[PDB]
Symmetry: C5
Subunit: 337 residues, 5 copies
């Protein structure tokens, strides 16, 4: 009678669960139960190129109607303790491409159950998931990546369960609040479709993000040191050819430094078999510094016999090398921009 | 009758739990249940700039009244075994910004339940939580950070549960006992407010700390080596210009050392896209050592033709370079202090 | 009666589980129960040479008939909630060579149960497993590896349980969709056999993959830098012998760089006691650069007394060293290809 | 009747647990229950300066009397299966300063229960705990550390539970068998006291160890290389001043090596804001090598104009530098010993 | 009646468990129950010198007789589902020196129960354990290690439980199949004894392995580079004394390289306070390269005044240094072999 009478509410809930079979889906043997899904993305923790995965924390909500749970006489929505979910049928929703995921359990299990008079159930979970994402690093670090989150029913086919994004394109929220230091979220999309397997067709919901990497870090960390070393190798041109130790030391250090930069960066990334965009720039800078050392070797080889010709090579090297390196940067950056 | 009669106490507790429904909150269908919260901060384990999070261990206590648990005839507060909490309704309190948290369980679950004659429940938990904290590292390592701990109800709106800091500004204790080697806790604040969501308004408690980083470590580790290398590059000025190998080796090593210091430090920090305060100092020191090597290259280029002019440049470099570097430190440190 | 009548379905399922003993296998005391197995390989996460193991995520399905679960009057296959598996006998299938494995449990346990009127049970699990794989690295990085997944019954002998690949060679799917950046899957095989132990013979299913490592990464990371350093050591031949500091510095840096490359790479791999194919190439490159430094030491030792003979050695070194190194690469690569 | 009659023993144990309330402590509402504690330290796994904690594995035993468990007619102590502990009241003992701990569970839970006719309960647990320990590293690596293990009741005040070390100073055993490669256990102490909190006074047991670090590793790893580099810088004194490249290279390498040693060691330790004892020695060695390079710079600056004075400075540097460095070691080591 | 009649088998098993008390050991209050143990070692995953432990995966089987489980009328051994073990008494066997261990649980718990008509129980577990092993590294890497696995009863004394190796020396199998890249298993032993504690004597089973480390890896990784650097320092002897920069650079690089090799290797090993066998060789190689640099310093100090004597020292250094180093290797290797 009275909504505030807890004895009446307790009796109503007890009647719903009496004879309730968790082993059977709602409308078992009839039309498939439609499950609506919304995601409130709390944050994207990290994006790992080494492991080809990203970590996602979100509020995962499922919406479906179970006529066995319909109640009358209480004009209110019943928000029950989360432990009642273990006594109710829930969809066997799982993430297809996840690698490791869990539900937060402090202070209690991060779970909520809300009932409605018509029998509709609101089921929410706070989940941190690590989802695999294959990334094409050919244009790294100027690449754009597309990481998805595939949602599917594990055991029920389309004849038993159907999926849909509740709210259309507004089903997923919080994308604008995601703060990735290395990436920017250009766009997100929602896809609903059915996938055919050997046992039958299964419902599928896809949430995908298009990530564009920020180049500001790589300019300061990799590109600028490579340019400075290349400019450092040009100092040998203005050094007199009689300074054999000084000019060879300039050639050796720049060549060795360029190799260390190229090798050290590649160790951080996964052992991919192809060449990246940054690798092309690093290998190009290696050629310029290597030719600078070979330039003095040619000069040192003819400086005694032909001092006039050796001086000309040094004088022209002060112009060709800076100009060719500028040309190399022009074609390189225009291609990848 | 007798408080020391365990049979009477057992019968009283059994009567309280007979017909008790854990699925229903206290005063279900009526006024919201007010939950008072106090925190005894045991320690702050670590503050991670790489992961943008901090680890917090604390005693989390919740205070609320459940009239179903009121008992008479026993003029004492009943401290029961912690396993009785699984038979009682508890608030669905969770931490909004946490990444991973757990309740200690040695030797038993670090949990306590205390009942009172009027039905009030004291519920304590010892929790270690890792909470995300976005940090602005533009002024690193001279930056000040503000890390919060957001407390919210997962399933109940403000019409069912209300939050408040029990004791006002004295609800959180142990802040003065926190020992962070790298940070000092300038201030902590307590905020109580309601946050509106799609499903309704939810109670929210916020505990925030203002952390000021200690610069003593970074002076010894990064700033002093950068200064010493810059001073090391000034030694080449007093070396005779005929020592081409000696002066170029001084120029090469200082330039290469400066690059290694700048790159090695940045690897430890997360790959942020902007420039930090320490990066500005490191790049400034790179210019001074690079110009020192270019100074000898100009001298070596004219020393044979114009020995008098070359000697003057070395003599003036012994004054301009130390003085300009002192000026650079003056403007740099005043801006960031 | 009606398939859509949930009360009739619930009564039918209750009758099946009444008197059902999970402790007894189907046809206990009679013919062994045949279990058919299919694997849908989701992905191969990584292949670790250091730990000698690989990570596999797959859909593991088991097929067997339990006459105690046969039902009549319902012309449909009963897809039940996954929690019904705890009330049914399941095979004690385990992976012989696994190191750590788990079943995904978000949002629910990644498990499915499907019943059939004749009593057949379909039991599916989504499992991520780390399986040990001993790898022979003598031809590393040009080696080919064979990693297996051994499937066995833990407690039942062949008199109680029998294994077979359901579908023959088509039992395992998704191999073509596996994307390993460092490896290519040449072939996979399915083996069914019985293994004799002290307690008796046990059923065994083997799934093996033949992996061929991609050499593209190692050419860019290890082979090319080794060649460049060796070519770098040849520059000293064109440098005049009077440049003692320049030519010795070329000899020292190349020798030290070669040692660092050989040692740094070997640290990543496990501390195997034998010599790898890459180690042979690195040691061969060390000899060439070491002899180049010794070449100038001989020249520097006789340049004053016999300038004509010293000049000849430098002139011939410009031909013998590039030609011998080319010969060394020819025999090396042909042997390992 | 017969002690070997298992039916009589089973009936006796069943009578004890009939009507037993685990929610109520022994002598509830009366005098506090006294709990005696003994520790058998299996080992101390590691001591971490970075994390400021140590790992401890021990046998934790609790002794208390529960008159509800008193039995007659069996003149023996009942060693029961460990699973009976879940049906009995146990103290809510927890470790105040622990960070992560667990009870071993292979093959069964590492737990034992022993009953006595008067009702006394022996409760043992094998626990591996990681306990926080703040360490003062000002005298590192010649420092002495004091790490404690605080034992407290989580929910019961002194009016309900009391703690004491069973056996006095002999309560903790196995300290002499602890093998720490880096530390030696000078002394251990046992403290029993009551700590006052907001909710009341709580029992507290403290076990502390005084650890003295072994300097043998640091002499071989850090101190000796620093001395050798300093002695290496003295070789430049005997080199002729005309060898500008040779003497500057000696100065550069020693100065750079000293910086690398100081920076590399400090990275391993936590980012403390103060100066350690080892840092003082490393900075002192930096001054000597830096002055050695500056010594030649002064000599090179006046060697042409005043060859006689330049030779004297080199001759005196061969005596002052070795003697002053010996003096620096004398005052340094005496202060810290 | 019929062995294939599952109803009769189910009734027989139900009778065994009716009135069965898991809290009481077999023959409680009488003679101790004898438990026979066999181990089938699957593999030894790794041996860690840093953590002083090894990882072991094995099949652990326990054999004992429980007359309460004796059955008649079924002339077969009952292999039951593994979940029946939770309804039976099992020995409280635990590993004394383990650090972390677990039982595999995919697809089900890796556990088996086999009953026999006389009441004997076969209990098998697949366990991966990490067991602590103190290692003496004085002769590292030419050392021999002895790692054990101590097996004990946690709560029952020798008056209640007794241990023995079932099969004598054949109780442990699979030792010959263990493949350790760094170690070879010389011998394994089985020990059965009783250990006296404060509460009484306890049964103990010990399984120990004698491991001999393979030196092949360390020859290629540490010993050969040390020899090559020492030989590299001998090149300076053939360089003319006028090449001050060349010979000092040879001296500096070899001395610095030797220090880096000694320090880098020691970082991998735990911070032990004593000197290892490899450290003795590395320190010996440091003396030879350091004396080589000091040899030229003496030559450079007298080359102008006494050119004849300086030439003799270089000539004799080409013989004494190679011969003394060969002598040093002879005494070193003979002592440790
Ligand atoms: C990251 O990468 C993934 C994988 O490539 C992208 O996911 C794809 O997204 C596109 C949309 O951008 C999807 O295309 C759409 O599929 C819908 C579902 O298809 C099912 O139903 C149709 C019949 O209606 C069947 O033919 C089909 O086989 C499926 O069963 C379609 O309904 C959509 O059609 C709409 O758009 C087209 C034009 O594109 C119109 O012509 C139609 O009239 C209609 O308006 C559309 O085809 C595609 O299916 C997704 N692939 C997968 C594997 O999920 C992500 O978008 C990408 N991330 C980002 C940020 O770009
Ligand atoms: C780390 O960063 C966080 C986020 O910026 C800071 O948290 C903020 O802290 C300030 C206080 O320092 C909060 O401001 C206060 O909010 C209270 C609650 O607001 C609710 O109720 C009011 C109506 O009463 C509504 O208008 C509002 O929308 C909310 O629903 C207010 O009650 C406070 O008002 C009091 O102070 C103001 C002056 O500041 C007076 O004018 C008022 O009369 C009154 O006395 C106040 O506005 C703010 O809400 C917090 N933000 C968040 C997101 O939590 C942390 O403080 C910071 N850490 C540190 C150490 O600085
Ligand atoms: C690592 O660091 C910790 C913290 O500093 C040390 O722990 C301290 O150890 C000392 C003993 O060495 C403790 O001092 C002793 O405390 C006992 C308990 O005090 C309670 O009871 C007294 C009244 O009896 C109250 O006044 C007090 O407030 C407490 O409620 C005392 O009983 C002891 O007194 C005995 O010794 C003194 C002389 O020291 C005599 O005068 C007395 O008559 C009596 O014989 C004593 O005072 C101290 O409390 C510990 N502190 C903490 C925080 O636990 C560790 O010892 C250290 N580790 C090592 C190896 O040194
Ligand atoms: C790694 O290191 C461990 C520890 O040192 C070694 O373990 C020891 O192994 C030896 C055998 O190699 C053990 O010695 C044997 O102990 C048996 C049990 O002793 C109990 O019973 C006797 C009475 O029978 C009591 O005196 C004793 O206190 C114990 O209660 C003995 O029965 C054995 O005796 C047999 O051999 C001796 C000769 O050695 C004969 O004289 C006897 O007649 C009889 O045949 C024997 O003494 C020793 O106990 C083990 N120690 C521990 C701590 O377990 C490992 O062997 C080693 N690993 C390897 C590979 O070497
Ligand atoms: C229940 O499952 C069985 C087994 O998958 C189905 O039987 C198969 O049905 C397909 C067509 O859907 C046939 O091609 C196969 O030959 C059948 N195999 C067997 C062994 O019968 C059965 O159809 C399913 N029941 C329903 C109602 O779909
Ligand atoms: C509350 O509901 C119960 C069950 O219908 C009823 O017995 C009780 O009288 C109600 N309470 C009031 C105050 O009406
Ligand atoms: C303790 O309380 C029980 C229940 O009321 C009662 O039966 C018993 O007599 C009491 N004990 C005493 C000593 O009064
Ligand atoms: C559903 O089945 C139950 C059990 O047989 C039966 O009592 C009930 O009447 C059936 N429902 C209908 C609509 O026939
Ligand atoms: C063992 O004790 C039970 C319970 O008292 C009794 O019924 C049984 O007869 C006893 N057994 C013997 C052999 O006396
Ligand atoms: C199987 O055993 C049960 C229990 O003894 C019995 O009732 C049943 O008749 C037996 N079955 C057959 C076919 O004899
Ligand atoms: C290692 C390659 C060196 C090339 C030197 C070319 C010199 C040409 C002189 C005519
Ligand atoms: Cl969590
Ligand atoms: Cl814990
Ligand atoms: Cl998972
Ligand atoms: Cl464990
Ligand atoms: Cl496992």
């Amino acid at each position: 009678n009275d909504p505030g009478n807890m004895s009446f509410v307790k009796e109503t809930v007890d009647k719903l669960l009496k004879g309730y079979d968790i082993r059977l889906r709602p409308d078992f043997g009839g039309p498939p139960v439609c499950v609506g899904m919304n995601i409130d993305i709390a944050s994207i923790d990290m994006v790992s190129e080494v492991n080809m995965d990203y970590t996602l924390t979100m509020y995962f909500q499922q919406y479906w109607r179970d006529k066995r749970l319909a109640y009358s006489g209480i004009p209110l929505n019943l928000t029950l303790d989360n432990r009642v979910a273990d006594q109710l049928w829930v969809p066997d929703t799982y993430f297809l491409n996840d690698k490791k995921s869990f539900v937060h359990g402090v202070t209690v299990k991060n779970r909520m159950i809300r009932l409605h008079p018509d029998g509709t159930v609101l089921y929410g979970l706070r989940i941190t998931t690590t989802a695999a994402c294959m990334m094409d690093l050919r244009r790294y670090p100027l690449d754009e990546q597309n990481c998805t989150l595939e949602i599917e029913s594990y055991g029920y086919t389309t004849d038993d369960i159907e999926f849909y994004w509740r709210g259309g394109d507004k089903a997923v929220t919080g994308v604008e609040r995601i703060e990735l230091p290395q990436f920017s979220i250009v766009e997100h999309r929602l896809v609903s479709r059915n996938v055919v397997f050997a046992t039958g067709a299964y419902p599928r919901l896809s949430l995908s993000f298009r990530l564009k990497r920020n180049i500001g870090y790589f300019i300061l960390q990799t590109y600028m040191p490579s340019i400075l070393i290349t400019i450092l190798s040009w100092v040998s041109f203005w050094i007199n050819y009689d300074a054999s130790a000084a000019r060879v030391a300039l050639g050796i250090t720049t060549v060795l430094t360029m190799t260390t930069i190229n090798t050290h960066l590649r160790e951080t990334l996964p052992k991919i078999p192809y060449v990246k965009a940054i690798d092309m720039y690093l290998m190009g800078c290696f050629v310029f510094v290597f030719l600078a050392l070979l330039e003095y070797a040619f000069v040192n080889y003819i400086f005694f016999s032909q001092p006039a010709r050796a001086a000309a090579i040094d004088r022209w090297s002060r112009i060709v090398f800076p100009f060719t390196f500028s040309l190399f940067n022009l074609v390189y950056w225009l291609y990848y921009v």
